[PDB]
Amino acid sequence: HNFETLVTFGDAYTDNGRLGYYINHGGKAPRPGTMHDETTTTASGGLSWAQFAARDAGATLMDYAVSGAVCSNQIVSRYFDLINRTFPAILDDEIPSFQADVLFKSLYPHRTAENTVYAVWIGTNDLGWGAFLSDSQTPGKTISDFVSCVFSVLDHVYKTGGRRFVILNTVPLELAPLYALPENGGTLDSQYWNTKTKYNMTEYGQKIREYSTSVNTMLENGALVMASLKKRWPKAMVDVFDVHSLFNDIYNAPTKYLDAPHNVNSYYHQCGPAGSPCTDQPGSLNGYMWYDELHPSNKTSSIVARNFLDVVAGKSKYGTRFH
Ligand SMILES: *[C@@H]1O[C@H](CO)[C@@H](O[C@@H]2O[C@H](CO)[C@@H](O[C@@H]3O[C@H](CO[C@H]4O[C@H](CO)[C@@H](O)[C@H](O[C@H]5O[C@H](CO)[C@@H](O)[C@H](O)[C@@H]5O)[C@@H]4O)[C@@H](O)[C@H](O[C@H]4O[C@H](CO)[C@@H](O)[C@H](O)[C@@H]4O)[C@@H]3O)[C@H](O)[C@H]2NC(C)=O)[C@H](O)[C@H]1NC(C)=O
Ligand SMILES: *[C@@H]1O[C@H](CO)[C@@H](O[C@@H]2O[C@H](CO)[C@@H](O)[C@H](O)[C@H]2NC(C)=O)[C@H](O)[C@H]1NC(C)=O
Ligand SMILES: *[C@@H]1O[C@H](CO)[C@@H](O)[C@H](O)[C@H]1NC(C)=O
């Protein structure tokens, strides 16, 4: 592997302990020059993709992702009672933490353009219930403004000297049990959407498919325009990792990717809409695409990580490379 350090921005799909730091510190971020304590039990039920990727590459992981995060709280935000403030966002919280940290040799002893890879995986929350899916954003903002936010994340990284960028696109959120119909293994009222069954679930599910696929088109063509034509990031490399297609591939051929029982339309950890009580399914978590109705399992996460390392090597059916 041709990198020593992996720096990640995102939400619970990536978070390896940083929301936990905020909860344990009254809603304060780690002091600059410090990182949160790492956990090996994430929203996946185990390691996140970033942990699998760093461990296989022999790289240091600097994981700024925060469970619950959106790209920009100026676009859309959600209040988190346990910290008495909004869930942290990438531009508002994660990037400012990273901008201060790179000044400390104790955290970044030898960060170069060549030896550090920067990845962003964001949009599951921005496009979902309580955000764009319920038209809860800042009035007038659109999903085009979310896509611009992702490129603004890369601008901030670029200005610190970063040059090797990976955008992970949005998953097929209509196949997450939170958004799927119950006839297809979807939740009834969920801990993440406790009034789901009062809405037209068919219409909301199709809407989130429209939003996710549209964001994915805009991220791929926007990355090519900005990188290759407008030279927005001179001497940078920008990969788009089509994790939407990888998730469709797992869903369509689970005997190729999962252990028994090769389950893609249900979820391992099944909680009532209060968030408790919860029962775990029988069998291995390695037999389930989804740990809960919104979060991919640690097995799915390990598949994302192996394909991510192929994208960074520039040899993936799921990677498109722009410079
Ligand atoms: C909750 O939310 C859901 C999702 O929005 C709502 O369900 C949608 O309702 C609309 C009606 O307003 C449905 O459209 C009708 O669909 C029927 C059946 O065909 C559809 O499904 C077929 C089976 O798979 C599919 O093959 C069809 O596709 C072909 O035909 C359409 C023609 O519309 C064409 O566009 C395609 O290219 C294909 O050739 C189609 O998807 C259909 O018979 C209806 O026809 C009437 O309307 C058309 C105008 O489009 C007109 O030509 C006809 O003369 C006639 O007037 C109409 O298309 C839609 O399928 C539902 N979508 C889903 C995903 O379920 C639901 O109503 C909401 N409920 C509430 C309470 O709000
Ligand atoms: C995902 O996490 C689960 C839960 O920790 C791992 O499975 C456990 O693995 C241990 C050791 O093999 C077993 O004793 C447990 O019975 C397993 N529990 C469950 C719930 O399956 C699993 O190995 C992890 N997978 C990956 C890819 O890391
Ligand atoms: C929560 O934050 C608000 C707004 O910043 C503040 O005024 C209030 O003191 C806080 N409330 C609690 C219960 O901590």
Coordinates of C-alpha atoms and ligand atoms in Angstrom, one line a residue:
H1 CA 0.0 0.0 0.0
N2 CA 1.4 3.4 -1.0
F3 CA 0.1 5.4 2.0
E4 CA 1.1 5.7 5.7
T5 CA -1.9 7.8 6.9
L6 CA -5.6 7.6 6.2
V7 CA -7.7 10.7 7.1
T8 CA -11.5 10.2 7.0
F9 CA -14.5 12.5 7.2
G10 CA -18.1 11.3 7.5
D11 CA -20.9 10.0 9.7
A12 CA -21.6 6.7 11.7
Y13 CA -20.6 4.6 8.6
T14 CA -17.0 5.8 9.4
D15 CA -17.0 6.9 13.1
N16 CA -14.5 5.0 15.3
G17 CA -15.4 6.8 18.6
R18 CA -15.6 10.5 18.0
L19 CA -19.4 11.0 18.8
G20 CA -18.6 9.1 22.0
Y21 CA -16.0 11.8 22.8
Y22 CA -18.5 14.6 22.3
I23 CA -21.1 12.7 24.6
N24 CA -18.5 12.2 27.3
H25 CA -17.4 15.9 27.1
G26 CA -20.7 17.8 27.2
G27 CA -20.8 18.4 23.4
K28 CA -17.1 19.6 23.1
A29 CA -14.8 18.4 20.4
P30 CA -11.4 16.9 21.4
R31 CA -8.9 19.7 22.3
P32 CA -6.8 20.5 19.2
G33 CA -3.7 18.3 19.3
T34 CA -5.7 15.4 20.7
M35 CA -7.8 12.7 19.1
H36 CA -10.7 10.8 20.7
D37 CA -10.2 7.2 22.0
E38 CA -10.7 4.6 19.3
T39 CA -13.4 1.9 19.8
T40 CA -13.5 -1.5 17.9
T41 CA -17.3 -1.6 18.3
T42 CA -18.8 1.0 15.9
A43 CA -22.3 1.4 14.4
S44 CA -21.4 -1.7 12.2
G45 CA -21.3 -4.0 15.3
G46 CA -17.5 -4.1 14.8
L47 CA -14.8 -2.2 12.9
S48 CA -15.9 0.5 10.4
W49 CA -14.6 0.3 6.8
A50 CA -11.9 3.0 7.7
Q51 CA -10.5 0.7 10.5
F52 CA -10.4 -2.3 8.1
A53 CA -8.7 -0.3 5.4
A54 CA -6.1 1.3 7.7
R55 CA -5.3 -2.1 9.4
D56 CA -4.8 -3.9 6.0
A57 CA -2.7 -1.0 4.6
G58 CA -0.6 -0.8 7.8
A59 CA -1.6 2.9 8.0
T60 CA -2.4 5.3 10.9
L61 CA -6.1 6.2 10.9
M62 CA -7.1 9.7 11.8
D63 CA -10.9 9.3 11.8
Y64 CA -12.8 12.7 12.1
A65 CA -16.2 11.1 11.2
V66 CA -18.9 11.7 13.8
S67 CA -22.0 9.5 14.1
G68 CA -25.1 11.6 13.1
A69 CA -23.1 14.0 10.9
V70 CA -24.1 15.9 7.8
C71 CA -21.8 17.8 5.4
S72 CA -22.8 21.3 6.6
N73 CA -25.0 22.4 9.4
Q74 CA -25.6 25.7 7.4
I75 CA -27.4 23.5 4.8
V76 CA -29.3 21.1 7.2
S77 CA -28.9 20.1 10.9
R78 CA -30.4 17.9 13.6
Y79 CA -30.4 18.5 17.3
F80 CA -28.8 15.8 19.6
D81 CA -30.3 16.0 23.1
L82 CA -27.3 14.1 24.8
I83 CA -24.8 16.9 23.8
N84 CA -27.3 19.8 23.9
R85 CA -26.3 21.0 20.3
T86 CA -26.6 19.8 16.7
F87 CA -24.9 16.6 15.6
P88 CA -21.4 17.7 14.5
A89 CA -21.0 18.3 10.7
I90 CA -18.0 18.0 8.4
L91 CA -17.5 21.7 7.5
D92 CA -18.6 23.1 10.9
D93 CA -16.8 20.6 13.2
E94 CA -14.7 17.8 11.6
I95 CA -12.7 20.1 9.2
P96 CA -11.9 22.7 11.9
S97 CA -10.6 19.9 14.1
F98 CA -8.4 18.6 11.3
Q99 CA -7.1 22.1 10.4
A100 CA -5.9 22.6 14.0
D101 CA -4.5 19.1 14.4
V102 CA -2.1 19.2 11.4
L103 CA -0.2 22.0 13.2
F104 CA 0.9 19.4 15.8
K105 CA 3.9 17.1 15.0
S106 CA 2.7 14.9 17.9
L107 CA -0.4 13.9 15.8
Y108 CA 1.1 14.3 12.3
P109 CA 4.9 13.6 12.6
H110 CA 5.4 13.4 8.7
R111 CA 2.3 14.2 6.7
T112 CA 3.1 14.7 3.0
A113 CA 1.1 15.1 -0.3
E114 CA 2.4 11.6 -1.2
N115 CA 1.9 9.6 2.0
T116 CA -1.6 10.6 3.2
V117 CA -5.0 9.7 1.7
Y118 CA -8.1 11.7 2.5
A119 CA -11.6 10.1 2.2
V120 CA -15.1 11.6 2.6
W121 CA -18.3 9.4 3.0
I122 CA -21.3 11.7 3.7
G123 CA -25.0 11.9 2.7
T124 CA -26.8 9.1 4.5
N125 CA -28.1 11.6 7.1
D126 CA -28.2 14.7 4.7
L127 CA -30.6 12.9 2.3
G128 CA -32.7 11.1 4.9
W129 CA -35.5 11.5 7.3
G130 CA -35.3 14.7 9.4
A131 CA -33.0 16.3 6.8
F132 CA -33.6 16.7 3.0
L133 CA -36.2 13.8 2.9
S134 CA -38.6 15.7 5.2
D135 CA -37.7 19.1 3.6
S136 CA -36.1 20.1 6.9
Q137 CA -33.1 21.9 5.4
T138 CA -32.4 25.7 5.3
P139 CA -35.3 27.0 3.1
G140 CA -34.2 27.2 -0.6
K141 CA -31.3 24.8 -0.3
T142 CA -31.3 21.8 -2.6
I143 CA -29.4 18.5 -3.0
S144 CA -27.2 20.3 -5.5
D145 CA -26.0 22.4 -2.5
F146 CA -25.1 19.2 -0.7
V147 CA -22.9 18.1 -3.6
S148 CA -21.2 21.6 -3.6
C149 CA -20.5 21.0 0.2
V150 CA -18.6 17.8 -0.6
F151 CA -16.3 19.6 -3.0
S152 CA -15.8 22.4 -0.3
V153 CA -14.5 19.7 2.1
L154 CA -11.8 18.8 -0.5
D155 CA -11.0 22.6 -0.9
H156 CA -10.3 22.8 2.9
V157 CA -8.1 19.6 2.8
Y158 CA -6.3 20.9 -0.3
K159 CA -5.4 24.3 1.5
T160 CA -3.6 22.2 4.2
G161 CA -1.4 20.5 1.5
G162 CA -3.5 17.3 0.9
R163 CA -3.5 16.0 -2.6
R164 CA -4.9 12.4 -2.6
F165 CA -8.7 12.4 -2.3
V166 CA -11.4 9.7 -2.4
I167 CA -15.1 10.5 -2.5
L168 CA -17.3 7.6 -1.5
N169 CA -20.7 8.1 -3.1
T170 CA -24.2 7.5 -1.5
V171 CA -25.4 4.0 -0.9
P172 CA -28.8 2.7 -2.3
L173 CA -30.7 4.1 0.7
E174 CA -34.0 2.7 -0.6
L175 CA -32.6 -0.8 0.1
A176 CA -31.7 0.1 3.7
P177 CA -34.4 -1.5 5.8
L178 CA -35.2 1.9 7.4
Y179 CA -36.5 3.1 3.9
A180 CA -37.6 -0.2 2.4
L181 CA -41.2 -1.4 2.5
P182 CA -42.0 -3.9 5.3
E183 CA -43.1 -6.4 2.6
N184 CA -39.4 -6.3 1.5
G185 CA -37.9 -6.6 5.0
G186 CA -38.2 -2.9 5.9
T187 CA -38.9 -1.6 9.4
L188 CA -42.3 -0.5 10.7
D189 CA -41.9 2.6 13.0
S190 CA -38.1 2.8 13.6
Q191 CA -35.8 4.3 16.3
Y192 CA -34.5 6.5 13.3
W193 CA -38.1 7.3 11.9
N194 CA -40.6 6.7 14.7
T195 CA -43.6 7.8 12.5
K196 CA -42.6 5.9 9.3
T197 CA -45.9 3.9 8.9
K198 CA -47.9 7.2 9.0
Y199 CA -46.3 8.3 5.7
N200 CA -46.5 7.0 2.1
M201 CA -43.4 4.7 2.6
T202 CA -43.5 3.8 -1.2
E203 CA -43.2 7.5 -2.1
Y204 CA -40.5 8.3 0.5
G205 CA -38.4 5.3 -0.6
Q206 CA -38.6 6.2 -4.2
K207 CA -37.7 9.8 -3.3
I208 CA -34.5 8.8 -1.5
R209 CA -33.6 6.6 -4.5
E210 CA -34.0 9.7 -6.7
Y211 CA -31.9 11.8 -4.3
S212 CA -29.1 9.3 -3.8
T213 CA -28.8 8.4 -7.5
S214 CA -28.9 12.1 -8.5
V215 CA -26.2 13.0 -5.9
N216 CA -24.1 10.1 -7.3
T217 CA -24.3 11.5 -10.9
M218 CA -23.5 15.0 -9.7
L219 CA -20.5 13.8 -7.6
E220 CA -19.0 11.8 -10.5
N221 CA -19.5 14.5 -13.2
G222 CA -18.7 17.4 -10.7
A223 CA -15.5 15.7 -9.6
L224 CA -14.4 15.3 -13.3
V225 CA -15.3 19.0 -14.2
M226 CA -13.6 20.4 -11.1
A227 CA -10.5 18.2 -11.2
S228 CA -9.8 17.9 -14.9
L229 CA -11.4 21.0 -16.5
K230 CA -11.5 23.8 -13.9
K231 CA -8.2 22.6 -12.2
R232 CA -9.8 23.4 -8.8
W233 CA -7.2 21.2 -7.0
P234 CA -3.9 21.6 -8.9
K235 CA -1.6 18.4 -8.8
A236 CA -4.4 16.5 -6.8
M237 CA -5.8 13.1 -7.6
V238 CA -9.5 12.6 -7.0
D239 CA -11.0 9.1 -7.0
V240 CA -14.8 8.6 -6.9
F241 CA -15.6 5.2 -5.2
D242 CA -18.9 4.0 -6.5
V243 CA -20.0 2.2 -3.3
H244 CA -23.6 2.5 -4.6
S245 CA -22.8 -0.2 -7.2
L246 CA -20.9 -2.3 -4.7
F247 CA -23.9 -2.3 -2.4
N248 CA -26.2 -3.2 -5.3
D249 CA -23.7 -6.1 -6.1
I250 CA -23.8 -7.4 -2.5
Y251 CA -27.6 -7.1 -2.4
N252 CA -28.0 -9.0 -5.8
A253 CA -25.5 -11.9 -5.0
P254 CA -25.3 -12.3 -1.2
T255 CA -24.0 -15.9 -1.4
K256 CA -20.8 -14.4 -3.1
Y257 CA -20.2 -11.8 -0.3
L258 CA -21.9 -12.9 3.1
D259 CA -21.8 -16.0 5.3
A260 CA -25.1 -17.9 5.9
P261 CA -27.9 -16.9 6.1
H262 CA -26.9 -14.4 3.2
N263 CA -29.4 -11.9 4.5
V264 CA -29.6 -8.5 2.6
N265 CA -33.2 -7.3 3.2
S266 CA -33.4 -7.5 7.1
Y267 CA -31.0 -6.5 9.8
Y268 CA -29.1 -8.2 12.7
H269 CA -29.9 -5.9 15.7
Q270 CA -33.6 -5.3 15.9
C271 CA -34.8 -2.5 18.3
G272 CA -38.2 -1.1 19.0
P273 CA -38.9 2.5 17.9
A274 CA -37.9 3.8 21.4
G275 CA -34.4 2.4 20.7
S276 CA -35.0 -0.5 23.2
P277 CA -35.6 -3.2 23.8
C278 CA -33.4 -5.0 21.1
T279 CA -33.0 -8.6 20.1
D280 CA -30.2 -10.0 17.8
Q281 CA -31.0 -12.4 15.0
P282 CA -29.6 -16.0 15.2
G283 CA -26.4 -16.8 13.3
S284 CA -23.2 -14.9 12.5
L285 CA -23.3 -11.1 12.0
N286 CA -21.1 -12.0 8.9
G287 CA -24.4 -13.4 7.4
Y288 CA -26.1 -9.9 7.4
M289 CA -25.6 -7.0 5.1
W290 CA -27.1 -4.6 7.7
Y291 CA -26.2 -4.4 11.4
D292 CA -29.3 -2.3 12.0
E293 CA -31.9 -0.8 9.7
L294 CA -29.6 2.1 8.7
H295 CA -26.0 0.9 9.3
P296 CA -24.0 -1.7 7.2
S297 CA -22.6 -4.6 9.1
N298 CA -18.8 -5.0 9.9
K299 CA -18.8 -7.7 7.2
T300 CA -20.2 -5.2 4.6
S301 CA -17.7 -2.7 6.0
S302 CA -14.8 -5.2 5.4
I303 CA -16.0 -5.5 1.7
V304 CA -16.1 -1.7 1.3
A305 CA -12.5 -1.5 2.8
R306 CA -11.0 -4.2 0.4
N307 CA -12.6 -2.4 -2.6
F308 CA -11.5 1.1 -1.2
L309 CA -7.8 -0.1 -1.2
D310 CA -8.2 -1.2 -4.9
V311 CA -9.6 2.3 -5.7
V312 CA -6.6 3.9 -4.0
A313 CA -4.3 1.6 -6.0
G314 CA -6.2 2.8 -9.2
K315 CA -7.3 -0.7 -10.1
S316 CA -11.0 -1.0 -9.1
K317 CA -14.2 -1.7 -11.2
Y318 CA -15.7 0.8 -8.6
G319 CA -13.1 3.5 -8.9
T320 CA -12.9 6.4 -11.4
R321 CA -9.7 8.4 -11.1
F322 CA -9.5 12.2 -12.1
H323 CA -6.6 14.7 -12.2
Ligands
LIG1 C1 -47.9 6.5 -2.5 O1 -46.7 6.7 -3.3 C2 -46.6 5.8 -4.4 C3 -45.3 6.1 -5.1 O2 -45.4 7.5 -5.6 C4 -47.9 6.1 -5.3 O3 -47.9 5.0 -6.3 C5 -47.7 5.4 -7.6 O4 -49.0 5.7 -8.0 C6 -49.1 6.0 -9.4 C7 -50.6 6.5 -9.6 O5 -50.6 7.9 -9.3 C8 -48.8 4.8 -10.2 O6 -48.8 5.1 -11.6 C9 -49.8 4.3 -12.3 O7 -49.2 3.0 -12.5 C10 -50.1 2.0 -13.1 C11 -49.4 0.7 -13.1 O8 -48.2 0.7 -13.8 C12 -47.0 1.0 -13.3 O9 -46.4 -0.2 -12.7 C13 -46.2 -1.2 -13.7 C14 -45.9 -2.5 -13.1 O10 -44.5 -2.7 -12.8 C15 -45.1 -0.6 -14.7 O11 -44.8 -1.6 -15.7 C16 -45.7 0.7 -15.3 O12 -44.8 1.2 -16.3 C17 -45.2 1.3 -17.6 O13 -46.3 2.1 -17.9 C18 -46.1 3.5 -17.5 C19 -47.4 4.3 -17.8 O14 -47.5 5.3 -16.8 C20 -44.9 4.1 -18.2 O15 -44.5 5.3 -17.7 C21 -43.6 3.2 -18.2 O16 -42.7 3.7 -19.1 C22 -44.0 1.7 -18.5 O17 -44.4 1.7 -19.9 C23 -46.0 1.7 -14.2 O18 -44.7 2.0 -13.5 C24 -50.5 2.6 -14.4 O19 -51.5 1.7 -15.0 C25 -51.1 4.0 -14.3 O20 -51.6 4.6 -15.5 C26 -52.4 5.6 -15.5 O21 -51.5 6.7 -15.6 C27 -50.7 6.8 -16.8 C28 -49.7 8.0 -16.7 O22 -48.4 7.6 -16.2 C29 -51.6 6.8 -18.1 O23 -50.8 6.4 -19.2 C30 -52.8 5.8 -17.9 O24 -53.8 6.1 -18.9 C31 -53.5 5.9 -16.6 O25 -54.1 7.2 -16.4 C32 -50.1 4.9 -13.6 O26 -48.9 5.1 -14.3 C33 -47.4 4.4 -9.9 O27 -47.0 3.1 -10.6 C34 -47.2 4.2 -8.4 N1 -45.7 4.0 -8.3 C35 -45.2 3.1 -7.5 C36 -43.7 3.0 -7.4 O28 -45.8 2.3 -6.8 C37 -49.2 6.0 -4.5 O29 -50.3 6.3 -5.3 C38 -49.1 6.9 -3.3 N2 -50.3 6.7 -2.4 C39 -50.9 7.7 -1.8 C40 -52.0 7.4 -0.9 O30 -50.4 8.8 -1.8
LIG2 C1 -18.1 -8.7 13.1 O1 -18.4 -8.6 14.5 C2 -18.8 -9.9 15.0 C3 -19.2 -9.6 16.5 O2 -18.0 -9.4 17.2 C4 -17.7 -10.9 14.8 O3 -18.3 -12.2 15.3 C5 -18.1 -12.7 16.5 O4 -16.8 -13.4 16.2 C6 -16.4 -14.1 17.3 C7 -15.0 -14.7 17.1 O5 -15.0 -15.3 15.8 C8 -17.4 -15.2 17.7 O6 -17.0 -15.8 19.0 C9 -18.8 -14.5 17.9 O7 -19.8 -15.5 18.1 C10 -19.2 -13.8 16.7 N1 -20.5 -13.1 16.9 C11 -21.4 -12.8 16.0 C12 -22.5 -12.0 16.4 O8 -21.3 -13.2 14.8 C13 -17.4 -11.0 13.3 O9 -16.3 -11.9 13.2 C14 -17.0 -9.7 12.8 N2 -16.7 -9.8 11.4 C15 -15.7 -9.1 10.8 C16 -15.6 -9.2 9.3 O10 -14.9 -8.4 11.4
LIG3 C1 -28.4 24.0 26.2 O1 -27.9 24.9 25.3 C2 -28.7 26.1 25.3 C3 -28.4 26.9 24.0 O2 -27.0 27.0 23.8 C4 -28.3 26.8 26.6 O3 -28.8 28.1 26.6 C5 -28.7 26.0 27.8 O4 -28.1 26.5 28.9 C6 -28.3 24.5 27.7 N1 -29.2 23.7 28.5 C7 -28.8 22.6 29.2 C8 -29.9 21.8 29.9 O5 -27.7 22.3 29.3

